[PDB]
Structure 1
Amino acid sequence: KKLFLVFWWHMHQPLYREPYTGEYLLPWTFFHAVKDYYDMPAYLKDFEIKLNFNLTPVLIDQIQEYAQGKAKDVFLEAIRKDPDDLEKEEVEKLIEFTKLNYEKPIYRFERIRELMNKEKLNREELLDLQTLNLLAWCGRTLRKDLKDLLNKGRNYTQEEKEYVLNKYFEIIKKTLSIYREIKEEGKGSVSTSPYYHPLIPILLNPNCVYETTPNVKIPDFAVSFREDASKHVELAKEKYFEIFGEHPVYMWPPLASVSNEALELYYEKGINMLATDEVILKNSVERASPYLRYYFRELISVFFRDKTLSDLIGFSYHAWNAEDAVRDFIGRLKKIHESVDFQPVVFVVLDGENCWEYYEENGIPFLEKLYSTLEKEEWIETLTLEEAMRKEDVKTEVIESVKAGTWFDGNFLKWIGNKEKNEYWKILIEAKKKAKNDYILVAEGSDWFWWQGEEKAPFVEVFDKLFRSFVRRAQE
């Protein structure tokens, strides 16, 4: 009797490229590419297990632009310059960026502490601030090559900074290739999502928000978004075909978000399998075991992630000693294995790039130990998505209806239903009536609604500028 374990690491960034200037207004695609997007699948070169990945098409577009030397990244321009040439505004943004990240373990450099305690920075100090901000985001692969620079800790030169930037762009240039390689080698499946990561259930039927939050107030959706929902899926299929030369048969629904109409759309577009969240299972089905392969209306296969295991990796284990977090994780899998009489399928699904910066050494001790341990367990078999879809010796059940929601409490309240978030939907509704191009699709991405109407925070006003610029461009 085996336990089947399926990791599905989801990778996404919203479009940071302002449409009128072409400038990338935040550097997060660059920093996660150098730190996570190459290195997460690259673990498969060193560990003989299966790991799966989701890449959103909008993320792929941006990785391609950086790899081509085309991305004008305003924050990275401030890192690259000699400090004698830094604008006052650029020094302020470098300091604000450092303060935003200062408590994360990847920023654990004594020199950063000294610099943030200084009243004014000279050129030598600013070079250290620029270079240490770069080095903080070093991925696993380059942490071996750049160990001497990482350990130097201070007194960085412009030449060393440029050397680091050159190595980082080499990683970016190899990033889409490593996803293709591990797919071609059978070491993992690669999925995609509807193109700009929207909330498909809302686009298809905004009234589905009342299924979990009947008392919510939403704007007047006086225009149809149903064709846009189809377009996000169709354009993603085309991007997937451009990258991999096949059409996809599985997709990750953004924010695990499903509804009856969304599941029907995925099936109509040729998707045979997806996963979603355990809370939606509990809201929809009586006997909510997350360890079965479900068939929605006997048409599309659906797995529900184990929320507890997914949340331990995402939120708990960054603060544990790596060996003890791995022992806890394996121990919980053993309890699942002993609790059921069939072979359970355990989906662990979460963002693949956002939790590691809170772990010691960017999660490398934890993941190396976790993967090395899984390599050895006879009663655990890690699976690709294709293998999970086809596995015959697993338990199955039919589901006839789901309650629409997301992986945030099984409802939509982080994206709609308060005054500020509703204002974004009102804007989008009005612009859709006059839309002329696919920037209306960019503006449908979930990220804009997520950041809106929350407690003020550094750089989050950039998301508002991007959203509104895409809305404006969509009508021209």
Structure 2
Amino acid sequence: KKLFLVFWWHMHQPLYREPYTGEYLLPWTFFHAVKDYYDMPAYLKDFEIKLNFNLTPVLIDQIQEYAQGKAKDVFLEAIRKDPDDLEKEEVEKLIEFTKLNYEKPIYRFERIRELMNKEKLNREELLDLQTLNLLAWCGRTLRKDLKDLLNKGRNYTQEEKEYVLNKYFEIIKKTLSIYREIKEEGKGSVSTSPYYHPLIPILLNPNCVYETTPNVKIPDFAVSFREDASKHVELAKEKYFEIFGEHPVYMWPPEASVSNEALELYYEKGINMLATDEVILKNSVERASPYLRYYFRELISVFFRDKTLSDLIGFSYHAWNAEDAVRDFIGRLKKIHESVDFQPVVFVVLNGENCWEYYEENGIPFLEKLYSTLEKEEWIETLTLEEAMRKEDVKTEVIESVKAGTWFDGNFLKWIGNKEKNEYWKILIEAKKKAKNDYILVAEGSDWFWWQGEEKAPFVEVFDKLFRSFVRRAQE
């Protein structure tokens, strides 16, 4: 009697490439590529477990552009430059970027503390601010190759900074190839999402927000987004086919977001399985074990992720010592294993790249001990998505209806409902009426709506500039 464990790491970045300049206005795709996007599947080179990944098509596009040397990244060019060439604006952005990340364990260099406490910074000190910002984002693989430069911690030279940059781009050039390798070797399944990570239930039917939050106020949806919803799925199938040579049969719905109508659309588009959140299941069915494989109207398979286990990794364990975290996690799986007489299916689903910067040493002690301990347990079998979908010694249930929602509280409040978020929607609506190209799809990305209506942060105006730029480009 086994416990079936399914990791599904979700990887996504909105499009940071401003369409009129062609400049990546924020370096987050670059930094999560050198840190997480190659390195998370690369664990499968050293650990005999199965791990699954979701890659949004918008993120693949950007990875492709950095790998080909075509991405113009404004923050990165400030890193690359000799400090005597830096503009005041670039020094300010570099300082600003440092203090935004200052308290994260991956930024714990004593030299950073010194530089931050300083007045003007000289050339040698600016070189250390440049290179320490680079090295802070170093992934598992290169933390070994560059071990001597990391321990240096100070007094970097331009030639060392450039050495680091070269190795970083070699990692990006390797990144799509390793997803294809782990997929081919049977070590994991790779899924994708609708192209630009939109909220499909809202695009299909904005009134679905009233299934959970009846008092919410939303704008006048005077145009249809239903065919755009199909295009996000269709175009995602094409990009996935280009990269992996098949149409995708698994998708991760952005924000775990599902509705009756979105489930039908995914079925119509050839998706045979997805996952969503335990809160959705609880809202939808009285009798709700998340350890079953569900079938929505016998049309499509649906797993409901284990919220607590997913939140332990994403919310709790950054604050723990790795050993104590791993023993806690294994203990919890053991109680699940002992809590049922059948073989449960346990889906651990979260973002694969955002929680590790808050762990000591980028979560590497945690994940290396987690994966090493998992591969030791005879009563745990980790599954690819393909295996979880076809596994026969698993218990099963049909579900006929779901209450539309997301994995944020089971509702849509974080993307629609207040004055500022609603304004983005009205802008989108008006613009959809005048749209002439696919940049309107870019503007339908969830991320724009998330950041709006709650600014208060360093760099959030960049997301607003991107959204409005895409909205403007869509009408030309």
Map Cα deviations across residues 305-341 of structure 1 (whole Å, 9 max, x no partner).
Answer: 0000000100100111101100000100011111112
Q: Tell me the equivalent position of 1:98.
A: 98
Runs in 1 of length 4+ with deviation above 2 angstroms?
Answer: none
CA distance in structure 1 between the partners assigned to 2:245 and 2:153 by the alignment:
45
Tell me how far apart the structure 2 counterparts of residues 290 and 25 of structure 1 sit (CA, whole Å). 41
Greater Cα offset, 452-461 or 103-112: 452-461
Structure 1 gaps, min length 5: none
Q: For the residues of structure 2 that align with 1:262 and 1:153, how far apart are their CA atoms?
A: 50
Q: Deviation of residue 150 (structure 1)? A: 0.3
The superposition leaves residues 181-231 of structure 1 with CA deviations (integer Å, 9 ceiling, x where unpaired) of 000000000000000000000000000000000000000000000000000
* Deviation per residue, 1:103-124 (Å, 9 max, x gap): 0000010000000011111111
Cα distance per residue 1:101-159 (max 9 Å; x no partner)? 01000001000000001111111100000000000000000000101000001110011
Q: Aligned residue for 1:41? A: 41
**How far apart are the structure 1 equivalents of 2:334 and 2:160?**
48
Name the CA distance, whole Å, in 2 between partners of 1:245 and 1:376.
33
Give the CA deviation at 1:455: 3.6
Aligned residues: 476
1:272-315 deviation per Cα after TM superposition (whole angstroms, max 9, x unaligned): 10000000000001111110000000110000000000001001
Give me the CA root mean square deviation: 0.4
Offset at residue 392 of structure 1 (A): 0.5
Distance of 2:351 and 2:221 partners within structure 1 = 30
1:215-259 deviation per Cα after TM superposition (whole angstroms, max 9, x unaligned): 000000000000000000000000010001111111000000000
Hey, what's the Cα distance between the residues in 2 that align with 1:324 and 1:456? Answer: 35
Q: Secondary structure at the match of 1:436?
A: coil
Q: What TM-score does the superposition give when structure 2 sets the normalisation length?
A: 1.00
Paired with 1:119 and 1:305, the residues of 2 have a C-alpha distance of 49
Cα offset, 1:33, TM superposition: 0.2
Report the Cα distance in structure 2 between the residues aligned to 1:214 and 1:339, rounded to whole angstroms: 37
**What do the CA deviations read for 1:359-418 (whole angstroms, capped 9, x no partner)?**
011000000000000111000000000000000011111101000000000000000000
Q: Indicate the residue corresponding to 1:26 in structure 2.
A: 26
SS at match of 2:9: strand
Superposed, 1:334-349 pairs within 5 Å as 334-349=334-349
User: 1:30 and 1:63 mapped to 2: Cα distance?
Assistant: 8
The aligned counterpart of 1:113 is 113
**Whole-Å separation in 1 of the counterparts to 2:297 and 2:340:** 25
Corresponding residue SS for 2:350: strand
Instruction: Quote the offset at 1:446 in angstroms.
Output: 0.1
1:274 aligns to 2:274 (yes or no): yes
The alignment partner of 2:263 has SS state of helix
Paired with 1:360 and 1:216, the residues of 2 have a C-alpha distance of 40
Normalising by the residue count of structure 1, what TM-score does the alignment of the two structures yield? 1.00
Q: For residue 295 of structure 2, give the secondary structure of its aligned residue in structure 1.
A: strand
Q: Find the residue that maps to 1:130 and give its secondary structure.
A: helix
SS in structure 2 of the partner of residue 155 of structure 1: coil
State how far apart, in whole Å, the 2-side matches of 1:441 and 1:91 are.
Answer: 35
Distance 2:374 2:444 in 1: 39
Please give the alpha-carbon distance, in whole angstroms, between the structure 2 residues aligned to 1:131 and 1:8: 33
d(CA) in 1 for partners of 2:241 and 2:455? Answer: 40
- Structure 1 counterpart SS, 2:5: strand
Which sections of structure 2, spanning at least 5 residues, go unmatched? none
- Secondary structure of residue in 1 paired with 2:61: helix
Supply the distance in 1 between the matched residues of 2:118 and 2:138 (Cα, whole angstroms). 25
Looking at structure 1, the residues matched to 341 and 276 of structure 2 have their Cα atoms a distance apart, in angstroms, of 24
Deviations 1:416-435 (A, max 9, x none): 00000000000000000000
In structure 2, C-alpha distance between the alignment counterparts of 1:321 and 1:250, rounded to whole Å = 34
- In 2, the alpha carbon distance for the partners of 1:455 and 1:197 equals 21
Q: Distance in 2 between matches of 1:87 and 1:311?
A: 42
Residue number in structure 2 paired with 1:171 = 171
CA displacement at 1:456 relative to structure 2: 1.3
Counterparts of 2:84 and 2:2, CA distance in 1: 62
- Displacement of 1:78 in angstroms is 0.3
Question: Structure 2: how far apart are the matches of 1:153 and 1:53?
Answer: 33
**Structure 1 residue 6: Cα displacement:** 0.1
